[PDB]
Every structure is written in structure tokens, then in C-alpha cells.
């Protein structure tokens, strides 16, 4: 809508207070005009019809419990946008400042979130397996990253190329969590998963096997579930990415870590320059080696660590 840019305040899913960019025209709308062509947050009103209604509020204060998922979707989209702009010089997900749209309160008891090709969508959870999914900054950045991947490499959501697609989203969701300094870790979804149980998460990058996901290529899932295991086999790449950043010895293979900043630079380059819609794990390795080569030289420690990390998870 057309109006005056302003700033409101509210409380997120975890009860923390934050400022959010809104737009004023009779009502105050969740429309942030300070980033690209805008960040827009919508209310799906427990239906499955999308996008729903641009979020309208009478007084620019968002402290109602119904408000919480919208506050976080809107705010964390902004943070994710800032990460791509400040760190990788990328303007929104398409590189030309496309508007970012999210709907919250999607359906009833919906325990997922997703990018649907045009926008992000967040369930409220059922209150025991998940609380509202926009409460997790690694979740929001994971989904938004799917949009980045779709406009660049175009990795198909099937088999190995789909596992790569999921791992990239876990990797950048995590880097964005570290960027925001939001109690960062190498786990996925810990802030919104199982509010009854502390210390757990949906997936772990540092030790995928903790939840039954493979951490070596020899253990990859080869059946048909989950589109050929796109959320399962991602553990092999997540573990590789964790090793490149943090170092470690895994199945007897030792990796010298090069840290988060270089991990992000290497993977962002692989993603935007070398990967294609049908890339498999072996092609990911070549893309990553070539990226680190471009950036740091063929005899650098950085190239060496990328090679050892993929050797450690059995990807040749
Ligand atoms: Ca209000
Ligand atoms: Ca965390
Ligand atoms: Ca996390
Ligand atoms: Ca939990
Ligand atoms: Zn995903």
C-alpha cells in the first residue's frame, strides 16, 4: 500500500521485544519500505488460501499473542535480507530487489514452513511438536534461501540435487543465525521445535547422526520417501560444511577449519556460479573446490580443507 514509513514495536514468538518497520495509511501495515521493493507480511487467518490479507494493525503496537508470528516473520525476513546484501552483495533473492512476502497463521496445527515458488509460508505448529515456525531465525533464513537457490542454481527438489538444495538452506540458515548472533549454534530449528523438551532440534549439522541422518556417503538413503531423501541425505553435506568451518576428525580423516566467513564465501560462489539444476554430490565437491580455488588460490589451505572435508564424508 502507499503510505508513510514508520517504526512499530512488538513481541516475537519467544517473548522478546523488537522494533519493526511498518507503513502507515489509516492502519499500520506490516510493510517494510526500507529494504529493496519491500518486505510484506500477510495474515492467512488459519486458511490455506494465499497470500491472505496484508497485516493491518490499528496502533502500531504488536503485543497480542496472535501478533507474535507475524512480528518474527517480518523482522527475520529483514535480517536475512541484510545478510545477503551486506555479506554477499546480493539484493533480495532474485538479485534485483524482489519484494519478499510471507504469510503466517497458515492452516490449523501446521507443523512446517516453506517457500512455495513465490513466497514464504509459516504454520503455527500444533503446540507440542512445534510452536510457530517463524520464531526461529534459522528457519526463516532456510526458507528464504530456497528462493535464492531457485533463482540461481535451480537445484531440482529430487534425489542428490534436492539434498544439496536442502543443505544450502541449512547452511545459510545457520550463517544467518550467526550473523544475527541469535544464540547461534550448528543445529536447525531448536528455538521452535518441541517446546516441551530442551536441548534438541530438528537436524544437527555438527552431528547429523544424532537424529538418525547420514554423516557419510556410504550411509545415504537410496529409497523413495521424502523425494528420495532430500531432508535425510542433506546431513552428508551439512557435516561437510560443518567440518570446513570448524575443523575436526571424522571417520579418521582430519580437517583444519577455515571458519564461517570463508565457508559462506565458498558456498555462495559455488551456488551462484557453478551449480546447475541436476548437480549431484560429486559435482558439488568440484564446484566447491573450484570456488575456493578462484578465491584463495589452488595451493591455499582453503582448497585443502574443502578437499579433506568432502573426503571425510566419502564424497569423491
Ligand atoms: Ca496493535
Ligand atoms: Ca540457536
Ligand atoms: Ca540453529
Ligand atoms: Ca525442544
Ligand atoms: Zn528446505
UniProtKB/Swiss-Prot annotation:
Q: Could you say which residues bind Ca(2+) 1 here?
A: 57, 59, 61
Coiled-coil positions: none
EC number per UniProt: 3.4.24.27
User: Which residues catalyse the reaction?
Assistant: 143, 231
Originating species: Bacillus thermoproteolyticus
Cofactor: bound how, per the entry note?
Binds 4 Ca(2+) ions per subunit.
The UniProt gene name for this protein comes to npr
Q: What protein name applies here? A: Thermolysin
Which annotated residues bind Ca(2+) 3?
A: 177, 183, 185, 190
